[PDB]
Write a protein that binds this ligand. Sequence first.
Ligand SMILES: Nc1ncnc2c1ncn2[C@@H]1O[C@H](COP(=O)(O)OP(=O)(O)OP(=O)(O)O)[C@@H](O)[C@H]1O
Length: 241
Amino acid sequence: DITFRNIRFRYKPDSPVILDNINLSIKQGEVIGIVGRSGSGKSTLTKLIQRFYIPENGQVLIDGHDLALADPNWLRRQVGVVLQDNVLLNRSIIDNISLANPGMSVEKVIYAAKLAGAHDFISELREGYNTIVGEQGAGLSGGQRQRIAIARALVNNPKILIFDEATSALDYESEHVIMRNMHKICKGRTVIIIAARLSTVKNADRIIVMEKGKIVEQGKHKELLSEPESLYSYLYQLQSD
Ligand SMILES: Nc1ncnc2c1ncn2[C@@H]1O[C@H](COP(=O)(O)OP(=O)(O)OP(=O)(O)O)[C@@H](O)[C@H]1O
């Protein structure tokens, strides 16, 4: 239901070719992980789903709808993105999470904070969800701030959700609580996970390996780790030692 066909893309006229001839189908409800060297074009692939850019060759389509012709507002509702680092407005946690669904009850915010593994640390705060984050009020850790952002993203309920190195700075136990629920957070919707840390995407239905603007490998963790001279096995071979 997300389709890339013969996609070539560069950022500007004199830019080098970033994506060269990608062909790819991601079906609805599928957890897909994307790995590869720094600069291989992982994010750029992801940016083409958001119509931040028009590709010089080929089409990007969502359930048949070409993103060249699609309505620009309809587009922004389809995709939710959690980057490595996220803003957080200078106000309460409750108000920060509720950006995704204005008019939300406390109960639903609880639910979504539980889902992102944020509820335990929020509750321990003096003022709970009313606590006030941002560049003035009581600061938080990276990981904690990152967990609020993910809760926020979970409430939005996009038909396509992108994690762009979102748990890369999170501890293994905190990442797991989030991912475990992704088996329930992908229910009816696509989950795209760009990861430097291979084990982050260990339970993906499919893992895509990028190298110099193209998909050179694919399969499950096992299917990819069966090939000895594959790039995936080389990456995994490192720092598992
Ligand atoms: N706004 C931009 N303008 C021009 N070139 C860009 C822009 N953003 C990215 N690039 C180039 O595109 C290539 C891939 O970018 P991208 O961020 O998709 O890689 P990545 O695989 O996500 O890298 P990393 O793992 O380092 O985040 C890089 O060579 C980079 O220089």
